[PDB]
Amino acid sequence: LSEYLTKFQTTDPSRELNVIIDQLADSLEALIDLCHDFPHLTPKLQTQLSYLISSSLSNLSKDIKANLGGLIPQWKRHLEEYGYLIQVLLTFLQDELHKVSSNVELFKRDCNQMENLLESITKLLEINLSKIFQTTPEKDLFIGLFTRPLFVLLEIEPVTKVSSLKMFIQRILAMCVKNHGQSSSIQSSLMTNLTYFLHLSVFNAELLKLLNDEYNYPQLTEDILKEISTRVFNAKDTTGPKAISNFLIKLSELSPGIMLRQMNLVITLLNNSSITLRCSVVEACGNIVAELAQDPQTMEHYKQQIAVLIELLEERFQDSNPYVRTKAIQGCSKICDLSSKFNKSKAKFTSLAVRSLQDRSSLVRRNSVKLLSKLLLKHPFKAIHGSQLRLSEWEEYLKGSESQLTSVLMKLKLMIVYYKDAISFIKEIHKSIELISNLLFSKNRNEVLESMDFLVLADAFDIELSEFGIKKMLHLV
Amino acid sequence: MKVEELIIDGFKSYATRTVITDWDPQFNAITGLNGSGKSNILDAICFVLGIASMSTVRASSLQDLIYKRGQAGVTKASVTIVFDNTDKSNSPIGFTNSPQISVTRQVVLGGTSKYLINGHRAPQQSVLQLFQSVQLNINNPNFLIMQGKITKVLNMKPSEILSLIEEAAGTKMFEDRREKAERTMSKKETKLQENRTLLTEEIEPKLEKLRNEKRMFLEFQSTQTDLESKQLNEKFQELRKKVNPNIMNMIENVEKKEAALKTMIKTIEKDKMKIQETISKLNEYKRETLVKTWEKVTLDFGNIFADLLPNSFAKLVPCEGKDVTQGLEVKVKLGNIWKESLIELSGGQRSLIALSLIMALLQFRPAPMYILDEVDAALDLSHTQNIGHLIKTRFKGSQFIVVSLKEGMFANANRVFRTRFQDGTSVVSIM
Amino acid sequence: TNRSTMMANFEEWIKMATDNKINSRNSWNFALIDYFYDLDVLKDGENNINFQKASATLDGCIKIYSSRVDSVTTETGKLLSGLAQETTLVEFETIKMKIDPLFK
DNA sequence: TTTTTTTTTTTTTTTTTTTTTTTTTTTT
DNA sequence: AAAAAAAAAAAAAAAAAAAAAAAAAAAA
Ligand SMILES: Nc1ncnc2c1ncn2[C@@H]1O[C@H](COP(=O)(O)OP(=O)(O)O)[C@@H](O)[C@H]1O
Ligand code: BEF
Ligand SMILES: [Mg+2]
């Protein structure tokens, strides 16, 4: 076995193929010799050989399932040569598959025999396989024989693109991490793929989501998050940071709750100078809060975590670069687009937007004005007493309430607090409208268009100073 | 190239968008009063080609090329030129499949020299190689004569005459590009040496460290299979410090990537050697190519000057003791006696010599266009008429854009553009 | 029929080099340096060197060389990244920014 | 209609090329 | 004594490359 792996790593057939078919339905060496010459042997017989080996492997898996002292060593040995042979098949198929798409009919043929071998390998892996390999090193080597070719194949981009093969590989890895106790090896392989490639972050995120949701196993993703937090990067490549950022964004958008557990340590990544990493962290926090605000049980469980993530979201508005501020503005926009609680956070967002309208970054200005527009569109002060706000009318109502002022006491207190909050919001909106009318004369076409849209929305939601901006817009001719 | 239309907007006198078309690809002449804008049209044509010397076309900086500095309302100055790629022989190497090529240069108070090719933003370099590939190298022109510089042609240094000769047969566009390639390769070798230094300095000790970590695992594996007693368990617990259970896959990946890096480095060195050898053989060839070009241009120059003036001759010779590659000078013979110094020649004679040299260069390899500004300033009426007739009849080949104030050349001009300063700006009309 | 394929590959590679579409990813796919070494491609019908084609080949070779150097550099960066295993906040004061139509 | 890919266009940072003086020099 | 070429270095300005956002065409 070990000598066979050492040799393999260091390094008219049709007549014998029919003989092997009949025997299966020193012959062992003949099959290996036949399988060793795939690059030269015709593509016709390869399909039949792959189908035959898949059928034999499925039959043996069914026999093992039916059975479960017994003939344990014999079955273990037979599975060992079958695993070696399927590894040889996988290596020879990824050979020239790396060559193609680097023609297309051969690509379809190779992919089809690949899904056949994937069903065969899933049928193999579905069994417990624990008692037959008593020693952990033997099990580790046997399953590495299966997994390493899978990662070498995932190195190829179309393999990751094709959904059937992607799903089969994800299922294989999920079953492994769930039952064979190889979380460390799988995590190391995934981290190597992430640090060496850019097209596997989405694959890793989807695999982690599948493992979590359909196996109740968050340990692998928690360990991956801890390792990502503790890693350090060099300035020259930035490809590792970019892949990590993409993986974090995808994981946040898919499954936020599980990653919330390790986000406390993940936050430490913000101290790095990586623009991509900082943007990914802030966008991940925003996605987590946005997709966790839906579940009242989730708020009741993670009030403190959601509060600290939101607080970091407001605090990250101050940075030298504009990109993290822009990502924080999108996070705030998602939060305010959510129809939920945290009117205090909404008021803080309003204050931050009106304060940051004067940023030197045109992108940040555009995003702040868009945030203010969405705030105007979905302000909480519209459930009762209409949806139109006016300074004089609100002041008159506040004065009337003050003049009129247990149950009645608390009702008046709540009404006064609501009116004061509305007055503050309207004053902030008036200041924002004045600043946006001043800023409208800007070079950026997108900025001008979005400021015009904000002014139109403000005029529609009748405001005393809105006509001012309207005149400014008339002046844009 | 056979330019067919020219668009000038906000450039010097032409403040309004003036589009001039119907360019006859045989002989185009521009006429008008003093200050009408003919030289302004030539300056606009020079602008789009990518001229760098600002003092050349009557200017000091990029701002004064706009109608009235940054003032008077006009803020941007754009010049657009459109050629014809019907003939693929005289076509850009990189744009043979794209007919009707267009080049636009725009200058703004804020921006600087924005270039568009076929509507797509392109760098200044891109248009530089685009125009150099069609012999329109305006930085060292071989077809461009400004106003008042016709009599100074014989006053240029022998190095500039050598550059003029090298502009033909593709000898130019090669010295500067080899120099730039050498600079780029020298700069890249610094980075290559840096990567090699990090490869041989830090990565290798890590290689021995991971090899030492590899042995530890081979033993620890046996220890585990026995454990699967108390002293062995204690030893196993104590040895769980540098076990690195996933050392095999990581070390295999590192070795594979290092092998790939070494192969790429070796192939890079091989490519460098091949490029150097190719450059050596190429310049060894261009030496003899320059020899042939010089001989042919000298013969054509002599023939043209003999034809223009019946009792004169001219030739191009190397220096007194230096070879051809050092420089080239002009020798003139009148009657049966050679002239030791060219400073005693007449202004008309100097203009005729310059025209004969330009026509010899055209006869060797005709440039796509030839632009002349006040070429007949020091020529009499008879010589002006003879030059115009010879351009119309015998030379042909290329497209001529000549600014003339005398009837001699534009009387028989195939196409005539007349300029008037009408109202604040300049307008161009047919005939 | 190798001549036609070589000419087609040469034309497409020169077009790509002119278009500035050569980068680190496609560096080890289009090797026109070999065609530069064999100068038969950049020759006319009279065994003469076409210097416009020579300049195009030199430009392509230099661009591919630079792209390959960048690829080697980023691979080395990846190797050190895989083998290697504050106060970014700034006060907001520095973030301040600090009649034409009718007049025109 | 929804999503992935192309590509084009927005700054920001760094790179390349210009033009300034500053001396240095030799033949008449 | 006296007139004009010429090598040399730093400051300013044009310009290219990196990186992300917006817009149009294409496949499921
Ligand atoms: N930057 C500029 N802004 C405004 N006017 C200009 C500028 N440069 C040149 N002009 C005007 O354009 C005219 C150019 O005349 P020109 O074309 O040289 O006449 P000709 O073609 O007869 O030689 C000049 O009279 C000058 O006053
Ligand atoms: F100086 Be003369 F009129 F050629
Ligand atoms: Mg003039």
Coordinates of N, CA and C in Angstrom, one line a residue, chain B residues 73 75 93-97 123 126 129 133 169-171 173-174 177-178 181 184-185 188-189 191-192 195 198 203 206 210 254 257-258 261 264-265 267-268 271-272 274-275 277-279 281-282 285-286 289 365, chain C residues 10-11 14-15 18-20 28 33-34 36-39 42-43 48-49 51-59 61-77 79-80 82-85 104:
Chain B
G73 N -15.4 81.7 -21.9 CA -16.5 80.7 -21.9 C -16.1 79.4 -22.4
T75 N -14.1 76.1 -22.5 CA -13.4 75.4 -21.4 C -12.6 74.2 -22.0
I93 N -0.2 48.5 -38.0 CA 0.0 47.1 -37.8 C -1.1 46.5 -36.9
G94 N -1.5 47.3 -35.9 CA -2.4 46.8 -34.9 C -3.9 47.1 -35.2
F95 N -4.1 47.8 -36.3 CA -5.5 48.2 -36.7 C -5.7 47.9 -38.1
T96 N -5.3 46.8 -38.6 CA -5.5 46.4 -40.0 C -6.9 46.0 -40.2
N97 N -7.6 45.4 -39.2 CA -8.9 44.9 -39.3 C -10.0 46.0 -39.0
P123 N -4.2 55.7 -24.0 CA -3.2 56.5 -23.4 C -2.4 57.2 -24.5
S126 N -0.3 54.9 -26.7 CA -1.1 54.1 -27.8 C -1.1 54.9 -29.1
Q129 N 2.6 55.1 -30.7 CA 2.9 54.0 -31.6 C 2.0 53.9 -32.8
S133 N 3.8 53.9 -36.4 CA 3.7 52.7 -37.3 C 3.3 53.1 -38.7
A169 N 12.4 53.7 -44.2 CA 12.7 52.2 -44.2 C 12.5 51.6 -42.8
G170 N 11.9 52.3 -41.9 CA 11.7 51.8 -40.6 C 12.9 51.7 -39.7
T171 N 14.0 52.4 -40.1 CA 15.2 52.4 -39.2 C 14.9 53.1 -37.9
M173 N 12.0 54.5 -35.1 CA 11.0 53.8 -34.3 C 11.6 52.5 -33.7
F174 N 12.9 52.3 -33.9 CA 13.6 51.1 -33.4 C 14.7 51.4 -32.4
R177 N 12.8 52.5 -29.2 CA 12.1 51.4 -28.6 C 13.0 50.3 -28.1
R178 N 14.2 50.1 -28.7 CA 15.2 49.2 -28.0 C 15.7 49.8 -26.7
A181 N 13.0 49.3 -24.2 CA 12.9 47.9 -23.8 C 14.1 47.5 -22.9
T184 N 13.2 48.9 -19.5 CA 12.2 48.1 -18.8 C 12.7 46.8 -18.3
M185 N 13.6 46.1 -19.2 CA 14.1 44.8 -18.8 C 15.1 45.0 -17.6
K188 N 13.0 45.4 -14.6 CA 12.3 44.2 -14.2 C 13.3 43.2 -13.6
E189 N 14.6 43.2 -14.0 CA 15.6 42.3 -13.4 C 15.9 42.7 -12.0
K191 N 13.5 43.4 -9.8 CA 12.4 42.7 -9.1 C 12.7 41.2 -9.2
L192 N 13.2 40.7 -10.3 CA 13.5 39.3 -10.4 C 14.6 38.9 -9.4
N195 N 13.0 38.7 -6.0 CA 12.2 37.5 -5.8 C 13.2 36.3 -5.6
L198 N 14.6 36.5 -2.0 CA 13.6 36.0 -1.0 C 13.5 34.5 -1.1
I203 N 12.8 31.2 2.3 CA 12.0 30.1 2.0 C 12.8 28.8 2.2
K206 N 12.9 27.6 5.9 CA 11.6 27.0 6.2 C 11.5 25.6 5.5
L210 N 10.4 22.5 7.8 CA 9.3 21.5 7.5 C 9.8 20.1 7.2
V254 N 3.7 23.0 -1.1 CA 4.8 24.0 -1.1 C 5.9 23.5 -2.1
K257 N 4.6 24.1 -5.7 CA 4.6 25.5 -6.1 C 6.0 26.0 -6.3
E258 N 6.9 25.6 -5.4 CA 8.3 26.0 -5.6 C 8.9 25.5 -6.9
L261 N 7.6 27.7 -9.6 CA 8.3 29.0 -9.5 C 9.7 28.9 -10.2
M264 N 9.3 28.7 -13.9 CA 8.9 30.0 -14.5 C 10.2 30.9 -14.5
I265 N 11.0 30.9 -13.5 CA 12.2 31.7 -13.5 C 13.1 31.3 -14.6
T267 N 12.4 29.7 -17.4 CA 11.9 30.1 -18.7 C 12.0 31.6 -18.9
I268 N 11.9 32.4 -17.8 CA 12.1 33.9 -17.9 C 13.5 34.2 -18.4
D271 N 13.9 33.4 -22.0 CA 13.2 34.4 -22.9 C 14.1 35.6 -23.0
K272 N 14.7 36.0 -21.8 CA 15.6 37.2 -21.9 C 16.8 37.0 -22.8
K274 N 16.9 34.9 -25.4 CA 16.4 34.9 -26.8 C 16.1 36.3 -27.3
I275 N 15.5 37.2 -26.4 CA 15.2 38.6 -26.8 C 16.5 39.3 -27.1
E277 N 19.4 38.1 -28.1 CA 20.0 37.6 -29.3 C 19.2 38.1 -30.5
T278 N 17.9 38.2 -30.4 CA 17.1 38.7 -31.5 C 17.4 40.2 -31.7
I279 N 17.5 40.9 -30.7 CA 17.9 42.4 -30.8 C 19.2 42.6 -31.5
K281 N 20.8 40.5 -33.6 CA 20.7 40.2 -35.0 C 19.9 41.3 -35.8
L282 N 18.9 41.9 -35.1 CA 18.1 42.9 -35.7 C 18.9 44.2 -35.9
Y285 N 21.2 43.8 -38.7 CA 20.5 43.9 -40.0 C 20.2 45.4 -40.3
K286 N 19.8 46.1 -39.3 CA 19.4 47.5 -39.7 C 20.6 48.4 -40.0
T289 N 20.6 47.9 -43.6 CA 19.3 48.5 -44.1 C 19.5 50.0 -44.2
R365 N 10.2 56.1 -49.9 CA 9.0 55.5 -49.3 C 8.1 56.7 -49.0
Chain C
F10 N 0.0 34.9 -34.9 CA 0.7 36.1 -34.8 C -0.1 37.3 -34.9
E11 N -1.1 37.3 -35.8 CA -2.0 38.5 -36.0 C -2.8 38.7 -34.7
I14 N -0.6 40.0 -31.8 CA -0.2 41.4 -32.0 C -1.4 42.3 -31.8
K15 N -2.6 41.9 -32.2 CA -3.8 42.7 -31.9 C -4.1 42.8 -30.4
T18 N -1.6 45.2 -28.9 CA -2.0 46.6 -29.1 C -3.1 47.0 -28.3
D19 N -4.1 46.1 -28.1 CA -5.3 46.4 -27.3 C -5.0 46.5 -25.8
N20 N -3.8 46.1 -25.4 CA -3.4 46.2 -24.0 C -4.2 45.2 -23.1
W28 N 1.3 32.9 -19.6 CA 1.8 31.6 -20.0 C 0.8 30.9 -20.9
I33 N 7.3 35.1 -28.1 CA 8.8 35.3 -28.1 C 9.5 34.2 -28.9
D34 N 8.9 33.0 -29.0 CA 9.5 32.0 -29.9 C 9.4 32.5 -31.4
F36 N 9.3 35.6 -32.2 CA 10.3 36.7 -32.4 C 11.7 36.1 -32.6
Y37 N 12.0 35.0 -32.0 CA 13.3 34.4 -32.2 C 13.5 33.9 -33.6
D38 N 12.5 33.3 -34.2 CA 12.5 32.9 -35.6 C 12.0 34.0 -36.4
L39 N 12.9 34.8 -36.9 CA 12.5 36.1 -37.6 C 11.8 35.9 -39.0
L42 N 8.6 38.0 -39.4 CA 8.7 39.4 -39.7 C 9.6 39.7 -40.9
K43 N 9.4 39.0 -42.0 CA 10.1 39.2 -43.2 C 9.1 39.5 -44.3
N48 N 13.6 40.6 -46.6 CA 13.9 41.9 -45.9 C 13.1 42.0 -44.6
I49 N 13.7 42.6 -43.6 CA 13.0 42.7 -42.3 C 12.0 43.8 -42.4
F51 N 10.3 46.3 -40.4 CA 10.6 46.9 -39.0 C 9.4 47.3 -38.3
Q52 N 8.2 47.5 -38.9 CA 7.0 47.8 -38.2 C 6.5 46.5 -37.5
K53 N 6.7 45.3 -38.2 CA 6.4 44.0 -37.5 C 7.4 43.7 -36.4
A54 N 8.7 44.1 -36.7 CA 9.7 43.9 -35.6 C 9.4 44.7 -34.4
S55 N 8.9 46.0 -34.6 CA 8.6 46.8 -33.4 C 7.4 46.2 -32.7
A56 N 6.4 45.7 -33.5 CA 5.2 45.1 -32.8 C 5.6 43.8 -32.0
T57 N 6.5 43.0 -32.6 CA 7.0 41.8 -31.9 C 7.8 42.2 -30.6
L58 N 8.6 43.3 -30.7 CA 9.3 43.7 -29.5 C 8.4 44.2 -28.4
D59 N 7.4 45.0 -28.8 CA 6.4 45.4 -27.9 C 5.7 44.3 -27.2
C61 N 6.7 41.2 -26.9 CA 7.7 40.4 -26.0 C 7.9 41.1 -24.7
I62 N 8.1 42.5 -24.8 CA 8.4 43.2 -23.5 C 7.1 43.1 -22.6
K63 N 5.9 43.3 -23.2 CA 4.7 43.2 -22.4 C 4.6 41.9 -21.8
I64 N 4.8 40.8 -22.5 CA 4.7 39.4 -22.0 C 5.7 39.2 -20.9
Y65 N 7.0 39.7 -21.1 CA 8.0 39.6 -20.1 C 7.6 40.2 -18.8
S66 N 7.1 41.5 -18.9 CA 6.7 42.2 -17.7 C 5.5 41.4 -17.0
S67 N 4.6 40.9 -17.8 CA 3.5 40.2 -17.2 C 3.9 38.9 -16.5
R68 N 4.9 38.2 -17.1 CA 5.4 37.0 -16.5 C 6.2 37.3 -15.2
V69 N 7.0 38.4 -15.2 CA 7.7 38.9 -14.0 C 6.7 39.2 -12.9
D70 N 5.6 39.9 -13.2 CA 4.5 40.1 -12.2 C 3.9 38.8 -11.7
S71 N 3.7 37.9 -12.6 CA 3.2 36.6 -12.2 C 4.1 35.9 -11.2
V72 N 5.4 35.9 -11.5 CA 6.4 35.3 -10.6 C 6.4 36.0 -9.3
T73 N 6.3 37.3 -9.3 CA 6.3 38.1 -8.1 C 5.1 37.7 -7.2
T74 N 3.9 37.6 -7.8 CA 2.7 37.3 -7.0 C 2.7 35.9 -6.6
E75 N 3.3 34.9 -7.4 CA 3.4 33.6 -6.9 C 4.4 33.5 -5.7
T76 N 5.4 34.3 -5.7 CA 6.3 34.3 -4.6 C 5.6 34.9 -3.3
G77 N 4.8 36.0 -3.6 CA 4.0 36.5 -2.5 C 3.1 35.5 -1.9
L79 N 3.6 32.3 -1.9 CA 4.4 31.3 -1.2 C 4.8 31.8 0.2
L80 N 5.2 33.1 0.3 CA 5.5 33.7 1.7 C 4.2 33.8 2.5
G82 N 1.6 31.7 2.4 CA 1.3 30.4 2.9 C 2.3 29.8 3.9
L83 N 3.5 30.4 3.9 CA 4.5 29.9 4.8 C 4.8 30.7 6.0
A84 N 4.1 31.9 6.1 CA 4.3 32.8 7.3 C 3.6 32.3 8.5
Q85 N 2.7 31.3 8.4 CA 2.0 30.8 9.6 C 2.6 29.5 10.1
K104 N -21.7 82.2 -18.0 CA -21.1 81.7 -19.2 C -21.9 82.1 -20.5

